[PDB]
Amino acid sequence: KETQEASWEIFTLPNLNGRQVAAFISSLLDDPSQSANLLAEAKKLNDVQAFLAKAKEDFLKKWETPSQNTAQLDQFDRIKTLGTGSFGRVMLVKHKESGNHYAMKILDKQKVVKLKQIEHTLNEKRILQAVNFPFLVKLEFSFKDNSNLYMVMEYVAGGEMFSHLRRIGRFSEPHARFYAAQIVLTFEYLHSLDLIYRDLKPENLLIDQQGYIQVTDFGFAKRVKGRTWTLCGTPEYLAPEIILSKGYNKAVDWWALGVLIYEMAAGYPPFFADQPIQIYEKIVSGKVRFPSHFSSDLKDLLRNLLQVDLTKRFGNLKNGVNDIKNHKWFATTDWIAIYQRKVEAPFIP
Amino acid sequence: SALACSAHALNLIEKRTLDHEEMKALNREVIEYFKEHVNPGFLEYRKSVTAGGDYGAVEWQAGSLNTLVDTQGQEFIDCLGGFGIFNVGHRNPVVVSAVQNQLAKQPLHSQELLDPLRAMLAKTLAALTPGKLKYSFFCNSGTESVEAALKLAKAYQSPRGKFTFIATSGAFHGKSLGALSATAKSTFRKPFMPLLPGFRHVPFGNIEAMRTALNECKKTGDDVAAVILEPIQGEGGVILPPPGYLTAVRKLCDEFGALMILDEVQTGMGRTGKMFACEHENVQPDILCLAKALGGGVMPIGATIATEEVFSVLFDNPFLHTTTFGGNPLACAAALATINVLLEQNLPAQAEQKGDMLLDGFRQLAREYPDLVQEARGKGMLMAIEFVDNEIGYNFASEMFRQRVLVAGTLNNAKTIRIEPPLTLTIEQCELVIKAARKALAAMRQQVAFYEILHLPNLNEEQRNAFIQSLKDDPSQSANLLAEAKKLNDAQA
Amino acid sequence: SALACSAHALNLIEKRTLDHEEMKALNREVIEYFKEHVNPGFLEYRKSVTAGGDYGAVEWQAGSLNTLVDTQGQEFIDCLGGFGIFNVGHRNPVVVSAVQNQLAKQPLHSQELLDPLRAMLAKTLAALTPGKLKYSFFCNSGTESVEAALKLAKAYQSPRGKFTFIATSGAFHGKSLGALSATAKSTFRKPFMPLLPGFRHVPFGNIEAMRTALNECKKTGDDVAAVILEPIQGEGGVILPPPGYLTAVRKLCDEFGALMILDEVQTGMGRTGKMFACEHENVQPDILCLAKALGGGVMPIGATIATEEVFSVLFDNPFLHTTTFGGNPLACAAALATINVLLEQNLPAQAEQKGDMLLDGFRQLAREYPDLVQEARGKGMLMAIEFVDNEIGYNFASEMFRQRVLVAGTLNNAKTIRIEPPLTLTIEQCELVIKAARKALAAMRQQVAFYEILHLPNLNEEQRNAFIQSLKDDPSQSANLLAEAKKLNDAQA
């Protein structure tokens, strides 16, 4: 009976399907000892998916009719000029009403049109405007005038992961576990809104004042329902399907995670050659032999994520995201606490 | 201080709406007090707390005629009607103003000066009641009703050497020691025994039996003073007696010179189709007990109407049986209002068409789920569904509670549930109810089936999982997948 | 038709004043109906018709807090207070609006959802009651009060093998069969016997007696379940027990493990000076019965408060003792209003100063007419004058009725009259009363003397006529002329 109580509670979860519940019932039937732990997990899962419901509804609302001119230029005071690109330049600004600091991106309308970047710009903005997740850069304001476009971004001090990875050389697996876990949750979120990210690389990973991650480039991300073909991205992180020129989907993101983890734990990418065409060869017939210091569990996950057989790839099975969340390498990670930001950062810049 | 507690409750009466934390506040005191000053048990066995939610469902105010709204704003359809109280609905505008008028003039009487409304009610009731029932006595409840009836019969019959009283098994008549001597359930009686000497029970609906009781008593010199019964056993589970019974009891009484007492406490005031249930067989008792719905859900009241021959006992010493609050003006008000409404919008006639559309509606549901329901039954707007288990029954009563449809049954006594919505239930709310009970019956069948799939011993986990999968994905197949699992479990048997 | 009779009474509720023939009309129906549907006896024995006048004194509406106005417009001072009902006066504005508020929200409860006012009252009463009295049960009257008390004691004590109940001679506790087993007057009990087995009466105020009852019962294996008594016998004629009695009963109970039940139905709610009479000797009972004035003369109500040790019986099966209307919201309202008023304007304290000024006022009158009054007695605003005859008594109660001062007593039971005016009686109305009783006592003494002069046999007509002459010309000499006539009748003896 005591077990039967926890059984019903698992089945009463509306957010959970037949497959999910039947999985918590089995474990209960087989382990009436972990009854409380099995019912607990069931509740996390339910709750967890439920929120994704509120996340999508909230996304579409903004995705459908997007915000425009949420601020104007004479609401800020130029402090310093942080950086310059081809689009224009980024300045540190102070919001006169609050005294808050942002990194405003000025991009010359006419310079964009030349660089043939009209779509990327529009798509990046429309995505950023609609998105909401802790590990993503937050577009606070957005506007334009006669001469240029303005994207007012939450300023976060701390370099790229690329340059930082050069400094340390390689991260200890607990360090890489902390970064992976964030990219995972980020990807869960984005996939939910039917968005491929398509541009995961250390360069697109900024580090929080809090030492957590912020994901920073969206020129490539697509709201894809079925399959797409545009190839964009860095050779090392392309899934074989991209190269091979057969349609792809959100699976591609999960491949890149694999590559990203490998690099953080090894100090170099798994498929690497002097010249690219060659990097593709090595990717397609996907033989990836690990370093010696690589944990067998970490090896098991990488063998799963880096899998040319996209019907055999972790991320796109029936349990989807949960497969690598429940993997042996991620037993020591508290996902919801990672989410809250209540986990001790391994490094603060 | 008591001064403190009085004021806080006094200001809350004045408040008409609540902030969500003003709500939270309330519900936690009310649970707290119920545990420490009322009964902790009502928190254990009642469906308002078991299925309460995060908070219990504390009452707040009436919605429409048929609806009730708790402290959270959740609106409930009353298919309980306070167990036969709310016959003209909650706060029936015609009753509420008759009360509020009378409240402006004089709420209670002095007990020395001829109070006019007690004449008017005594008169009206004389008019409204079949045959030679002429005099009304007025008390406060259904139990005080029966008690006075017992007292009338007694004072009448004891000079004639008759002391025994036949009542019927399953009969409910009141919880006060006198009525509890005629009330029949074991549970209700045992702790307080010894009760009144000389009360003997016979089976209900059995005229062959009651002859033998009346005759055995005759032979042994213990002749029967009076026979007391309800037209339908209400609490007794909506037991309908065989056609002709009430008429045949009436002769049997007349044959042995025994007074006939009719407890129309729960079937009075138009619930069964007629103004009084004893009109379906056109039977006139010597005494008639009324209450509940006589007070239009506004006031508490009980009336005892009797023939002149019988009520004469009280004539020579009118103080022999008094009560302090009986027949007070504003209770009187309420009844005349209720009696007026019932004859005006002619609600006994409504009771019969809504009472058959509903009940049929239930015995249909009852064919579709014979694995959860033995039977549905009723007569006009008094009806009940009988389940197989108290487990199941409390599960039905509770399930619909959450569907914001308020029905009977408590945690343990719940095998048979009673449906007693106001006679003012709209045809729109009428379906909404049969619909809610259909959803409810589905969900329970799901859960019932769910367990059935699990202890299938010959069935392996691999197969069981496939069923549980399709069960959650398609609760409609709860019957199909079940049959498929049982057929599979027998294949490996 | 009943439809007809309902409407006519319904429109009369609406009417607030009456044309003199609209009056005549009324009073004649009301007498007519009382004779044919209520009781003809109340027309025979009541002072409202005997001394009615051309018409009876049919009630109409409340005057001020202490006054009542009939259908002719005659305003009465209530020194009856509905036999201890109207403690805070008629239509106390604070109670009437608490009721009318609650009437706007929800008059009666559903019986499924935790009703908030029953917690608040249960709480307040816990606060208001001495010692470990914690749980309240709610019913509708004073009789239902005692019945539940008997039931609590029973359910508590029968598992411990104790079934006998001691009550006291002269005790009144209710007219319903259970309470009537403890009520003591012959008249009230005899027709309905046999009542509950195992109730034995002892003399009131006699601790020496009650020991012997409790002990005899012990010896014979009929051990006492509970002892039930009123703090003052109210109806019993305002009998005051000897100082120390209630305290000494309380130990006697504790010694024999018998529950102590206190019937504070007529001495509760501040009438005797304290909120509860059992506070004068600071005695805590196991059970406390309340009613009457708990409903602020607006609502009917009864409360049964008990220790936790005793009320526990109902915890495990909370449905063991229910009532249909008990604790309904708007009755609850009324009490909290009444409880608030009583503590605010601190009316128990008023009860003691008005209660001694009055009573002293009566025992003065009682010295001046020792030929018509044996004694006056009371405790706070519960008091009574004892005359020598029922003849005389009904003559007092009746005389003042015409002086528009409403006191107790009926045609036969009237030897001792009871004075129970509202606790809100002004000092102005306070004299007006003692004044009215002085006029009354004069006029009766006149008539008494008048006859005395006539059967003086030795006295001749010539002399008798001289006395009758000066008697009518000087009613003040009614005592002098009398003595002169008796002295003269003895001269010719």
Author numbering:
A (entry chain B): 107 to 455
B (entry chain A), C (entry chain A): 9 to 501
Task: Tell me, in the authors' exact words, what the paper reports.
Here, we propose a method for generating proteins and protein complexes with complicated shapes using fusions of alpha helices. To design amino acid sequences that can stabilize the alpha helical structure of the fusion sites, we superimposed one or two turns of terminal alpha helices of connecting proteins using a molecular graphics program. Our method does not require complicated computer calculations for the design process and can be used for the assembly of artificial protein complexes with predictable and rigid structures.
To demonstrate that target proteins other than calmodulin can be attached to the YgjG backbone with a rigid and predictable structure, we merged the C-terminal helix of ZpA963 to the N-terminal helix of the catalytic domain of PKA (PKA_C) by the shared helix method. Using the calmodulin and PKA domains as model proteins, we demonstrate that the shared helix strategy can be used to increase the effective size of proteins and to enforce four-fold symmetry.
